[PDB]
Amino acid sequence: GSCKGRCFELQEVGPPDCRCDNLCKSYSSCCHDFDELCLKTARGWECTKDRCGEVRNEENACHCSEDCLSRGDCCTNYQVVCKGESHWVDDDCEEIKVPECPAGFVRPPLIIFSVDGFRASYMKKGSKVMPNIEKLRSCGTHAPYMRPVYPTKTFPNLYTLATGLYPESHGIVGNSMYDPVFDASFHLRGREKFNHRWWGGQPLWITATKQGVRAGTFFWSVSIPHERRILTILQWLSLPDNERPSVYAFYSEQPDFSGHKYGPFGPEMTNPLREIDKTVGQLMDGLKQLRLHRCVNVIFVGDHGMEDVTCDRTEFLSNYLTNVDDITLVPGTLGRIRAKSINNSKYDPKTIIAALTCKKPDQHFKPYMKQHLPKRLHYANNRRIEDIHLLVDRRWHVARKPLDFQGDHGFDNKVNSMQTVFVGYGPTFKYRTKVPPFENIELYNVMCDLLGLKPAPNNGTHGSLNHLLRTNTFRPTMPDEVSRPNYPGIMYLQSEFDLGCTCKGSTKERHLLYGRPAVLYRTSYDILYHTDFESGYSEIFLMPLWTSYTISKQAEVSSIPEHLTNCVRPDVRVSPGFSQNCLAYKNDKQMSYGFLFPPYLSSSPEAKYDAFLVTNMVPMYPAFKRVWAYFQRVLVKKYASERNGVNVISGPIFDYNYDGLRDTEDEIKQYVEGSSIPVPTHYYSIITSCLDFTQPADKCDGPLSVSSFILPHRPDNDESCASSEDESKWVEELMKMHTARVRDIEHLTGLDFYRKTSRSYSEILTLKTYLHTYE
Numbered sequence: 059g060s061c062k063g064r065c066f067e068l069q070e071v072g073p074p075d076c077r078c079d080n081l082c083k084s085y086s087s088c089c090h091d092f093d094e095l096c097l098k099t100a101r102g103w104e105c106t107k108d109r110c111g112e113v114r115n116e117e118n119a120c121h122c123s124e125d126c127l128s129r130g131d132c133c134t135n136y137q138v139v140c141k142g143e144s145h146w147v148d149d150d151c152e153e154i155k156v157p158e159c160p161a162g163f164v165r166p167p168l169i170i171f172s173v174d175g176f177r178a179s180y181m182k183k184g185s186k187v188m189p190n191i192e193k194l195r196s197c198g199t200h201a202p203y204m205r206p207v208y209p210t211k212t213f214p215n216l217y218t219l220a221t222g223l224y225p226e227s228h229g230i231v232g233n234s235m236y237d238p239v240f241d242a243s244f245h246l247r248g249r250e251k252f253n254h255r256w257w258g259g260q261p262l263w264i265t266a267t268k269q270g271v272r273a274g275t276f277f278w279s280v281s282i283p284h285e286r287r288i289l290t291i292l293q294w295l296s297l298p299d300n301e302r303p304s305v306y307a308f309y310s311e312q313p314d315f316s317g318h319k320y321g322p323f324g325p326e327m328t329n330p331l332r333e334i335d336k337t338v339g340q341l342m343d344g345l346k347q348l349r350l351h352r353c354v355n356v357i358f359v360g361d362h363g364m365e366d367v368t369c370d371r372t373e374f375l376s377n378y379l380t381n382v383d384d385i386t387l388v389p390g391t392l393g394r395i396r397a398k399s400i401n402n403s404k405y406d407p408k409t410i411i412a413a414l415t416c417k418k419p420d421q422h423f424k425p426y427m428k429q430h431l432p433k434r435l436h437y438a439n440n441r442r443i444e445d446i447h448l449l450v451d452r453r454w455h456v457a458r459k460p461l462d463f464q465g466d467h468g469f470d471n472k473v474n475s476m477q478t479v480f481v482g483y484g485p486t487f488k489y490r491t492k493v494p495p496f497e498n499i500e501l502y503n504v505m506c507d508l509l510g511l512k513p514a515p516n517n518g519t520h521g522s523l524n525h526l527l528r529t530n531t532f533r534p535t536m537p538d539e540v541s542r543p544n545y546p547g548i549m550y551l552q553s554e555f556d557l558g559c560t561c562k563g564s565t566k567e568r569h570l571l572y573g574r575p576a577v578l579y580r581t582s583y584d585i586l587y588h589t590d591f592e593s594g595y596s597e598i599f600l601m602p603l604w605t606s607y608t609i610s611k612q613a614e615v616s617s618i619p620e621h622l623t624n625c626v627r628p629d630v631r632v633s634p635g636f637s638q639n640c641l642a643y644k645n646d647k648q649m650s651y652g653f654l655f656p657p658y659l660s661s662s663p664e665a666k667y668d669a670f671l672v673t674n675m676v677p678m679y680p681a682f683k684r685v686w687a688y689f690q691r692v693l694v695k696k697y698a699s700e701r702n703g704v705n706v707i708s709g710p711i712f713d714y715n716y717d718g719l720r721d722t723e724d725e726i727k728q729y730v731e732g733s734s735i736p737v738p739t740h741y742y743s744i745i746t747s748c749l750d751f752t753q754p755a756d757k758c759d760g761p762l763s764v765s766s767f768i769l770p771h772r773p774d775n776d777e778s779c780a781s782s783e784d785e786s787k788w789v790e791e792l793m794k795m796h797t798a799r800v801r802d803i804e805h806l807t808g809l810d811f812y813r814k815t816s817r818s819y820s821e822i823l824t825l826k827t828y829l830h831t832y833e
């Protein structure tokens with residue numbers, strides 16, 4: 059019936075009782091006196107000098123009476139104007155060496171201050187526009203930016219923060235999406251989004267609650283203004299020990315809305331940012347007056363940035379397709395295409411992909427079957443992700459027809475305009491510390507560490523951001539190796555093979571700079587030593603799982619001599635029964651081959667003959683060989699020249715079910731015609747070097763530097779619109795587009811890299827999560 063003494067109560071109440079919680083207005087279920095009692099606006103949100111030492115009047119929004127501090131419901135500036143205190147921002151930066159909390163506090167609390175559409179470059183405007191945020195940033199731990207997830211939209215990224223999962227795993231694949239099993243659609247606006255069936259993983263608030271850590275209700279009806287929310291969090295912090303929460307969240311809708319209307323670089327972004335900074339000031343002054351400003355950990359985090367995107371810069375599918383009322387398009391900074399009506403046999407995905415590929419010369423979107431999207435996006439393993447996908451250029455839109463804002467976002471998460479912010483301030487965070495950019499998928503683990511919680515299974519690499527924290531409650535531990543390698547000697551003569559083919563200390567210490575990769579699944583494979591390279595040959599897959607070699611700054615490149623162009627030699631160490639054969643490659647019209655260690659970089663003409671071994675051979679399409687041959691012949695030398703030598707671990711990936719994980723035997727769906735030689739979906743390479751570039755790769759004392767990619771193993775090069783031209787014009791931009799982290803390849807291969815270095819394991823986990831973006 060009533061909400062007296064009950065306003066913003068942390069417990070939910072079932073029917074037939076009316077509600078007084080922070081989300082009751084969105085569920086149309088508050089008591090009649092909720093607005094009266096709980097949403098008082100009288101006399102503003104700030105104490106004035108006139109109001110100091112007032113008698114308590116219950117109609118006021120916040121109070122300036124003597125008893126306000128006892129009750130914990132003063133205005134945030136009460137002590138500033140009435141007790142002559144300073145604003146938190148006006149004070150000197152002071153190191154928080156331990157948490158300074160009142161007695162009763164079993165842990166430092168966590169407040170997540172979430173900002174929507176906050177571009178990373180907005181922080182360059184600094185204390186001139188945002189005093190409080192610039193203090194948080196400069197005094198606590200901060201990054202130059204933080205990479206969001208794709209699509210760079212609100213709900214996928216916000217829920218990625220809460221779960222540490224990619225959108226494909228947590229299920230919130232866009233702001234808008236259709237589910238073929240539910241036969242229902244999800245939008246920002248509407249009642250469907252409240253149905254729990256859409257939301258997968260385990261968000262931080264559930265993780266907290268399940269492990270006995272009380273979480274302060276995260277969600278606020280849009281009717282409830284920002285000042286009220288800040289005041290309620292501060293009031294919750296005043297609650298007695300047994301009742302009060304240890305984790306809180308504030309979501310701000312700005313500066314997303316201002317970013318859309320006036321663009322990222324408009325003069326009209328300043329007041330939005332001042333409004334954000336003002337709100338942060340009310341939190342910090344409020345915490346300061348509750349004596350919690352050196353107790354609570356504050357995270358100031360964004361979900362994505364903002365780009366200049368005008369309606370004049372729009373692509374129309376009606377220029378490419380003659381069937382646009384047979385499809386439904388999810389439009390804008392990305393495209394997702396589906397059959398409009400279910401029960402339409404004439405709809406064909408292949409003809410749609412054909413009609414969208416490389417038509418205009420200046421075409422501002424690229425079509426994809428989702429399995430062929432760059433693996434770094436991890437945007438494919440969900441029934442709500444349509445098979446047809448359009449990656450739209452930065453600064454552009456894709457709509458269906460001309461009859462369907464100065465800023466937008468949703469583009470590829472590597473794009474600089476999509477980068478957002480991270481600051482961590484408080485006892486548990488480090489002091490005056492810059493840290494390198496990282497992915498928002500990592501933060502769920504950090505937030506669990508801050509609250510002393512065991513994270514749920516997620517896509518962060520736990521330990522990869524220990525360098526953000528003053529004290530770590532998690533020390534990372536190397537995974538145990540499952541499959542011991544065999545080291546088979548010579549045990550098969552050259553006359554004992556019939557394949558239709560015609561033609562160690564020094565190895566390890568130069569070609570495995572960072573130790574042997576550990577196989578974290580059950581299989582049988584062989585280590586094979588050669589002069590120019592080392593490999594882990596799989597007996598099950600008939601090819602190397604990995605092939606490691608090293609190329610100095612002054613190493614020569616050579617040709618494949620013409621009498622060895624078709625040369626394939628049987629490996630005397632490896633059985634015929636566990637070897638490939640060249641007869642399959644003949645009988646397979648579309649399938650050719652290539653080599654993992656390049657014959658183009660062999661140290662001598664004699665050593666070159668190991669490169670032509672059957673145990674270095676992998677299946678490759680003629681189209682792919684153009685990419686692979688350019689990489690090996692030209693670019694691997696180029697990287698050695700620039701980076702003072704490079705270690706290169708290359709190999710195959712099999713991911714036919716596009717889940718970003720290593721395929722088992724039964725999950726492989728294509729083989730070389732009439733054989734058991736499995737065809738890779740991708741080929742990787744992990745190109746490592748010394749960060750101190752003056753020291754060579756094999757003489758690196760300090761930290762390491764890494765690049766990697768996962769090239770898609772395609773029958774054509776339709777993805778590259780300049781594939782008719784010379785490889786110098788197109789293949790390097792293809793590679794850059796499919797750049798990857800070492801971690802992505804470890805998911806896809808079930809191998810573990812960098813197991814013997816001089817670097818600490820947490821530092822190596824940071825190396826494994828690194829992504830070169832070329833921006």
Ligand SMILES: *[C@@H]1O[C@H](CO)[C@@H](O[C@@H]2O[C@H](CO)[C@@H](O[C@@H]3O[C@H](CO[C@H]4O[C@H](CO[C@H]5O[C@H](CO)[C@@H](O)[C@H](O)[C@@H]5O)[C@@H](O)[C@H](O[C@H]5O[C@H](CO)[C@@H](O)[C@H](O)[C@@H]5O[C@H]5O[C@H](CO)[C@@H](O)[C@H](O)[C@@H]5O)[C@@H]4O)[C@@H](O)[C@H](O[C@H]4O[C@H](CO)[C@@H](O)[C@H](O)[C@@H]4O)[C@@H]3O)[C@H](O)[C@H]2NC(C)=O)[C@H](O)[C@H]1NC(C)=O
Pocket residue numbers: 223224226227228229255256257258259260436439440441514515516517717718719805
């Ligand atoms: C990124 O990290 C994630 C998490 O670590 C990785 O995803 C995980 O991948 C695993 C391997 O494929 C999956 O395991 C399989 O799960 C099947 C179903 O079981 C479910 O339980 C999951 C876990 O439940 C615990 O945790 C949750 C919190 O997350 C808590 O609520 C619970 O209390 C539990 O403690 C749960 O996550 C799953 O949820 C999925 O389905 C629902 C729909 O009902 C969706 O709402 C979810 O979003 C989620 O969907 C995603 O994942 C499924 C696959 O599970 C995809 O199909 C979807 O497209 C979507 O992406 C489930 O409810 C098991 O039956 C299955 O068993 C097989 O394999 C075993 C051996 O391995 C055999 O013994 C059996 O024979 C059997 O065939 C298997 O264990 C995880 O479910 C999955 N988890 C999540 C959260 O996605 C992901 O790989 C990482 N990415 C990379 C690149 O590394």
Ligand SMILES: Cc1c(Sc2cccc(C(=O)O)c2)c2ccc(Cl)cc2n1-c1ccccc1
Pocket residue numbers: 084216217220251252253254257277278279280
């Ligand atoms: C229901 C929901 C919603 S929908 C919502 C949230 C806050 C305000 C409003 C509003 O209309 O004013 C709407 C939601 C949004 C984001 C996240 Cl991370 C989570 C969100 N969840 C969610 C899902 C499952 C479990 C707990 C919360």
Ligand SMILES: [Ca+2]
Pocket residue numbers: 712713714715716717718719720721725
């Ligand atoms: Ca797989």
Ligand code: NA
Pocket residue numbers: 643644645646647648649650
């Ligand atoms: Na062939």
Ligand SMILES: [Zn+2]
Pocket residue numbers: 174175211212213314361362
């Ligand atoms: Zn957003």
Ligand SMILES: [Zn+2]
Pocket residue numbers: 175212314315467
């Ligand atoms: Zn937006």
